[PDB]
Amino acid sequence: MRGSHHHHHHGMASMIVVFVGTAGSGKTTLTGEFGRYLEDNYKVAYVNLDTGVKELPYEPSIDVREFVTVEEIMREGYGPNGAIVESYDRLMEKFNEYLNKILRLEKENDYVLIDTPGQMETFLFHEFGVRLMENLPYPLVVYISDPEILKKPNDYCFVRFFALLIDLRLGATTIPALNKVDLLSEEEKERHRKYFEDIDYLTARLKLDPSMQGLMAYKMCSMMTEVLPPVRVLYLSAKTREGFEDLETLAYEHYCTCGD
């Protein structure tokens, strides 16, 4: 219930779930709503690593905006994109402090949801993101995409390889997912699934592309067979909780598999 105070057993690993996605895919919404969902049964904590966001749909236990905001930095005459980078250079000075707060949380909660910088590139190309991720115990990364970017076959290969890239970069199990599935006509929904679920089929459609660019993508589906096999893409809705049971199951499974 909203008023439940769920108990976490102190000598027990929590589940850290980290949401990553380009600006606008629904990171902050998914954290809040997946949080609510879990709160029926679990002790959840919320970490906001995003210095830009104007308002939160959840009460954070940790909030980097308490320390500095993009808006504050822009007051110093920085442009927005400059203020965003500058904001993570400043937080980096306080790295251990935040690393240790997050680690504390992980001892005190069943779940810790991390809502990452609004721009995925801050998290992936700045020292703050990767150094945090190196230092967290088996964090589970949910990489979400707006389905509206899936307009041609090689987009499906794009998203899949980007998740792999994220998994390389952050050194964490990355789950590729779609958000905003609430908006998907069911034809749209089955297309996406077929391309994602049927890599023989995907590969074949990419075979047809005559472009110089098409050949490379068709080829790039070397992912498979001898290592790199396509993992199931999750379909989520942060508005309706479609896929929340899935996500929760996956996150528990990942949790059982780790600590081994």
Ligand X SMILES: Nc1nc2c(ncn2[C@@H]2O[C@H](COP(=O)(O)OP(=O)(O)O)[C@@H](O)[C@H]2O)c(=O)[nH]1
Q: Which residues bind ligand X (CB under 6 A)?
A: 21, 23-30, 81, 118, 179-180, 182-183, 237-239
The CB-of-165 to a copy of itself minimum distance in angstroms stands at 6
The number of residues making up the chain comes to 260
Of 9, 3, 87, nearest to 51 (Cα)?
A: 87
CB 129 within 8 A of CB 122: yes
Q: Does 169 interact with a copy of itself (rule: CB under 8 A)?
A: yes
Q: How far apart are the first and last CA of the chain?
A: 33
Residues 207-246 contacting a copy of itself, CB under 8 A = 211-213, 216-217, 219-220, 222-223, 226-228
DSSP one-letter code for 115: E
Residue with tokens 């203020």: 83
Chosen from a copy of itself, ligand X, none, partner binding at 239 (C-beta under 5 to 8 Å by type) = ligand X
183 is a site residue for a copy of itself (CB under 8 A): no
**Residue in the block written with tokens 């895919």:** 25
13 interacts with, out of a copy of itself, ligand X, none, CB within 5 to 8 A per kind = none
Are β-strands 140-145 and 15-20 bridged in parallel, bridged antiparallel, or unpaired?
parallel
Nearest CB to a copy of itself, comparing residues 92 and 103: 92
Both tokens of 222, joined, read 């070397």
Residue 195 in tokens: 């391309």
**203 belongs to the binding site for a copy of itself (CB under 8 A):** no
Q: Which does 158 bind (CB under 5 to 8 A by kind): ligand X, a copy of itself, none?
A: a copy of itself
Calculate ∠ Cα 225-220-254, nearest 5°: 55
Q: Judged by CB under 8 A, does residue 137 bind a copy of itself?
A: no
Could you tell me where the DSSP H helices lie in 60-110? Answer: 70-75, 80-92, 95-108
- Which of ligand X, a copy of itself, none does 4 bind, CB closer than 5 to 8 A by kind? none
Q: Which residues of this protein are in contact with a copy of itself, per CB under 8 A? A: 22-24, 50, 52-55, 70-71, 74, 77-85, 118-122, 124-125, 127, 130, 146, 148-149, 154-155, 157-158, 161-162, 164-165, 167-169, 171-172, 211-213, 216-217, 219-220, 222-223, 226-228
